[PDB]
Structure formats: structure tokens, C-alpha cells
Design a protein around this ligand. Structure first.
Ligand code: ZN
Ligand code: ZN
Ligand code: ZN
Ligand code: ZN
Ligand code: ZN
Ligand code: ZN
Ligand code: ZN
Ligand code: ZN
Lengths: 150, 150, 150, 150, 150, 150
């Protein structure tokens, strides 16, 4: 439950490990309880790093909503010079976003939420065999148990 | 790309296999291209089965949005009789929903979308090691390549 | 699940086999989910060939409507064959339509729908003995389970 | 060609025989020539018995509509007492309806109609082999020959 | 008769093979039954791939319109940097469209349609000798037999 | 360049050769530049003979539209031959139309147009192997180079 470094491989043709450092946790009026991680590469601007964020909010209807949002910024290619005669500054071309989003009733239990979670995970991994659902880790704490990091 | 049976284990303490049969594909004005699967258990009403749905829509901003939505209905427990003297009809207590949601620019490539996908999948599986991102299956066709089943 | 060739014998005095190949599936706003099959006799006009169609639609009442429509077109008589040009087959004189139509409530289960189905099938076959109701095949998927071909 | 008892097995997992007694014949403003059968079980009240009904109605443009409608009322399960301290009266939970519906031109012959009939019957029975089309019975008299019982 | 991969060589001076993956099936208000294929090259963004699409639309007076539309987006050549100092994003210069368009009466048979098809094909190939007309493949299913993939 | 006899085999089960002789060239305001060919069977009505037509028109968009339209008329059946008068062949029952239609931008070169052309030709021929795209013949003059017969 305490916030720690996340080591995760991406989905490149040869997957690349990313180390996501904790940025802190807090409460937002729109989003709920928010926890932030970020990679700290010197290759790209600080704001343009691969990042992971978790939101947890009880909606007006009483349904609890959880999200794990992965954002991967992709930079423009700096070439030559601009019309002013200078090398261009780094600029983000676009940011790809892939997230898990859960909607659960107050009555849903840890077992209920964990059960749905692994169906999606297996679908995303093209896995038709039996896989044990994780009961630890920040994702399990958020989706299964409604816990935000600290 | 052609729609086929999906065999997937859930996240119960002892995971249970579910066989999701295709229901068909089509276009909705609100949702985009929609493909539907459903389990066909005689244990529960037809509408109350575990189901999987994929949406794919180009938004007004030009950003393409993809979703894989897993819904698991949980039934009420029928006990005794109601105030009218009859056994109660089956009733859904609540429906848990867990989905993948991707937002991608038109410029994002198959490699870009696949790269983000596997970060989320590994996070959901508490996997800190290297895992090859699937390049086949309905989930990969939707998220990586923007393909809906047929 | 998905469309495949149907092989059926007709009710001629000496019954004849027909092979109905798939024509497609789609969602009509009025008809509902529609799946089409048709026999492909090489010389017979396309609209004169035996065809089979399934409709599935949820009405405003909540009652699900289900139909399996068999249409057998009958042409007029031929007068001859041109010596040098190409010669058309005569126009369709009439089309015979025999269909199963089911109206089921949401509460009705697989077993409920299957139970009524076989009563009608046995009635049409002039069968007073016990016959096991099919649990597979496209007709069972549609009538028993509310599943249209994909 | 006059009304007589009908013995039919249903499509339960272990199929059950039903004896349908003639119930009456009439003419309806909107339905046409109607003939009614009905079971006489002591288990349910009179209105709640399995019933079979045929309709023959001439439409415009020389087309007649023919129906054999099988309706199975499924009863609520009486358990315990109601809020007044009495055992509940029998109540219909829902009624399943499976029917044959034929649209035939006045130009079609007995052979044409009998031919279409058996295609549907074989489809409903999941039968891909040769089966002889019945030439007797109330279903054949109605579908093949446009005969209503009397 | 269901969607599968398509391998086709183009008409470059040294012809290049293209693999078109199934992209989806749908119904359109103005286009009719639509089936879509698309290449998956990593060279261009997703929208800029070579695509193939079939349309089947019933018109008035018993005539159906059938189209196989091949669209090849030709990309602008990215060279140097733009006025902002970045490498230019990929941009479509123009899209070339070559299609088969058939208008067939409901009275035409498989043989009639297949006969016309090969005349055009031989004309496009500058072939004055005898060539056997294909009886399989998505093009034959559509043009000869009015079949859309599913 | 200028109109000459076209010799083409059709797509009958045993393909038959047709000789299409020139009928003329002109400029229609709606259709564009039109060139006509038609087979000249001695006894077949003129409007019942196989014909081939090319249209070329620059649209308002600047897109050039190109069409090669093959029409095969099919007559009704003959009932006899008068003993002493002259006897007419029956009326055309329907006409099958299969055409190539190309939409090209002004920027697209010979090689661009020729490249798409052969994709469609190979698709219509169910050809997965490499085929050299024609650079001569009236179809190539029209589709590759935008040249109508003179
Ligand atoms: Zn990294
Ligand atoms: Zn299950
Ligand atoms: Zn046949
Ligand atoms: Zn009974
Ligand atoms: Zn009587
Ligand atoms: Zn390519
Ligand atoms: Zn399909
Ligand atoms: Zn000829």
C-alpha cells in the first residue's frame, strides 16, 4: 500500500523495461484519490515521461469508480532549424493512453472485483488458460480492495 | 478478425473457465463499431450472463477510442417466498464492470498502441519482468490495429 | 455460432437435399439481427433460389421475437431457348414462405424456450412419440438461446 | 379433418407426453378460421393448460396466412404462505409461444406447401438426412392443404 | 464466405505483394452491406493503409448494386524539416480509387453474373485468350453470387 | 489509340470468345468522352448483343473519373417461329453490368494508376501470385494514361 518503484516492460517488438518512480498521492475534487508514478529519463523533458496514475472516486450514484491510466508521450523529431535560425525545442507529438476502468457497486466484494479484473487481463494477454489473479501489488490493492497508495 | 468462441479464466480464488460465444457485430451511433460475446449458462437468465464487448469510435477531436468491456452480473439469492406467496423470479443484484479504454491519435502506429497496451496488462498482473506483447487475438486486433471482429 | 453451409432435405414426394450457403449478417432497425442463407444453383436466378433467414428483435414490450423464415420461390414455365443469344429463366410466379416464430419473455430460460420449440416441431412432423430436443445447431442457438449467426 | 385428440411429447430434458383435447372451432374478425386444443391436467387450472391453436386467414392479393400456435404457460412455484396466511393461488409466471407461420399464394399446390413445410421441420430438428413429409394429421391438413378442423 | 486475409500483388513496375487483414463488417444507411479489409504496414499510420471494401445495396425495380473498391493512399514524401524545425508528420498526398461496379437484376443467375465478370477482368488484363472464371474467393462470392463476407 | 475490334472470352463454364466491333466515339456533356463497342451476332437484336463502353470525365473536384462498362443483355425465351412471315427475337429480360471505375487525382502518375488497376484485376481473377500489369491495350490507355479511343 506504501508507494514504491514500479518496474514494468512495455509492448515493443523487443519489450523495454521502464522504472516508474513515485511522485506522491493526494485528493482531487474531480478525480478522487490520485496516486502518480513517473519514469525519470534524461532523454526526454520531465513532463514527457512515461507515467502511471490511479484514480478512485465514489460517484453520485454510489458506484465506486477506479482507474489505472498509463500514458506514453511520443516526441517530435527535431531536425535542422526552424524559420528563426535555431534548433527547435523538444515538443510532444502525441500521448498514447491506455487505462483500466472499473465500476463497482458498494455491495461488490474483494472476490467479485478480483474475478472481473482477471477476465480483462487474460483477454488483453490473449490467454485462454488458467491464471491466478494477483492478490498483492498496487493494481490489486486498487481494483480488488479500493486502496490507494501512500 | 472473424468472431470466435473465447475461453477465459476469471479471478476467483480458484479461477473458473468461461466460454464466451459470439453474438454478432454492428455499428451504433453512440458507441461506434460494437462486437459482443456472451456466455450461455443455463444457471442464470440469458441477459444475466458474463459478457465481453468491444467498442471502437473516432471522436469529434479525431482521437480514436477503443474499449474492451467485461461485465459480470451477480444474482440475488432467492429464498423462501415473497409477500404474494410465490417463489421470487431471478433478479440481478449488481453488475461488476472492468474495461480497457484506449485513446490514440491518428498518428499513433500499431507499435505505439501495442507498447502502451502491455504496460497496463503487466501492471494489472503484478508483473515486473519482460512479457511479449500479443500480436494476435481479438484484443490485439482492436487495441493495436483498430480492428473490430466480424 | 458463425455462419456455415446448411444441408436440408425438402418435403417433396421424393425428398431432395439443398445446400444453403451463407449470404451475410447485419442489423436492420426494423427487422433486428438478420442472418441470411441461400442455395446457389448455377443456372437458377438468384431470387428464385431457396433461401433461409433468421430475425431476432426485442420489442417494446420486452418480449423477444424470433423467426426462422424458409422461402421457396417458384418460377413460371419456360417457352424455349434462343439459338444464338443468352436466354433468361422466367419470372418468379410466387414464393412460398414457411417460418417458425417465437415470442418469449425475458424470464423464460433455455429450457422453457426449448420445451415449446419441440412441441411445434413434433406437431409439424406428425410425431406422437418422444423426441429429444436439439441443443446445438443454428435453430437451437436462435430459438433456445437467442443467439444469431455471427 | 375433424377435431380429435393430439398426443405430443415436449422438449424437456426428459420429454413429457401431453394429450390435447379439442376445445372448439370458430370464426374471428381479425384471426380467421380458428381451431383450439388444450390439455386437461388436474395440476393447473383450466386456463393455465398447454394449448394449441390454428389460424387460417385470407389476406389481400390472394395470399393466405396459416399459423399453428403452441403456447405453454409456465406456472409460478407456490411455496409457503402469502402475507395473509394462506397458500397462494396458482399464477402464471410467463407464457412461452412457439408457432409455425406460413404465407402461401392461392397459386401454390399441395406439393409446393408440403415441400416447404418439411425443410423447416428438418431445420428445427437439426436433421440433415432425408425424412418423409407427413401427408396426414392436423398440421399437414392445415399447412399442406389449407384445411381447418371442423 | 466469412472474412479472411487477402494477398494481392499491385501493378507497380516491379509488383509488390500486399496482405489485407479483415477490418470489419457493418450495415450502412446509404451504402448497404459493407465489408472492409486493410493492410497493416508499419510504414504508414493506420488510416493511410491500402484498403479494400465491398458494398451490396438493393435498389428499386429489383436491381442490386455491387462494388469492390480498392483505395491506395499515396503519401507525401517527408524530406528535411518544416518551418517549425521538426520532421513533418506523415500526410496523404492523394488517394487513388479503382473499383468494380456491378448492376445486376434479381433475375440474373450465378452463371450470368460470372460470365460478365470475366469479360471485364480479361479486358483489364489485356487478355484475348481463354481464361477460366474463378468460382471461389470473396470477389466471386460477391459478384457471382451476391454474397457479402460475415 | 483508335478503335479496333476487341476479342474477349467470357466467363461461361466453357468460356466463349466474343468479337466486339467499334460503334463510335463522341463527347457527351454528362458522361464525358465515350467510346462504344458491340458484338455483331447476325440474328441477335442489336440491343441484346454484348457491348463495351468507356467513359472519361473530369469532375468538379478535379478528380478524373474513368469507367470501362461491360453489359451483357439476356433475352426472354422463344415460343416458336412463324411459318410465313418474319419472326422477332424476344425482348431483353435484363442486362448484367460489370464495370471498372477509377477515381484518380491529377497528381497520380501512370505508375500510380497502373498499380491500383492490377490489384483489382488480380482480385477479380482470384490471383495471389505476381502478374505483370499491362502497359498497352485500350484498357491501359484509359486507366493508366487517361486516353480514350479516337
Ligand atoms: Zn525506459
Ligand atoms: Zn462459467
Ligand atoms: Zn436443390
Ligand atoms: Zn402434461
Ligand atoms: Zn365438426
Ligand atoms: Zn505493401
Ligand atoms: Zn462472422
Ligand atoms: Zn459470342
Amino acid at each position: 500500500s506504501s508507494q514504491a518503484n514500479i518496474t514494468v516492460f512495455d509492448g515493443a517488438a523487443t519489450p523495454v523495461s521502464h522504472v516508474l518512480v513515485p511522485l506522491g498521492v493526494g485528493i482531487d475534487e474531480n478525480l478522487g484519490s490520485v496516486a502518480k508514478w513517473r519514469e525519470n529519463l534524461a532523454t526526454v523533458p520531465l513532463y514527457a515521461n512515461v507515467r502511471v496514475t490511479t484514480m478512485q472516486k465514489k460517484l453520485k450514484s454510489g458506484i465506486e469508480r477506479v482507474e489505472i491510466r498509463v500514458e506514453v508521450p511520443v516526441m517530435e523529431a527535431v531536425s535542422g532549424q526552424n524559420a528563426f535560425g535555431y534548433t527547435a525545442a523538444p515538443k510532444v507529438a502525441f500521448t498514447d493512453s491506455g487505462s483500466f476502468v472499473g465500476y463497482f457497486s458498494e455491495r461488490s466484494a474483494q472476490s467479485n472485483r478480483r474475478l472481473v479484473k482477471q477476465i480483462l487481463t487474460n483477454l488483453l494477454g490473449n490467454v485462454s488458460t488458467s491464471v491466478a489473479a494477483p492478490t498483492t501489488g498496487f493494481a490489486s490493492e486498487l481494483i480488488d480492495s479500493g486502496i490507494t497508495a501512500s
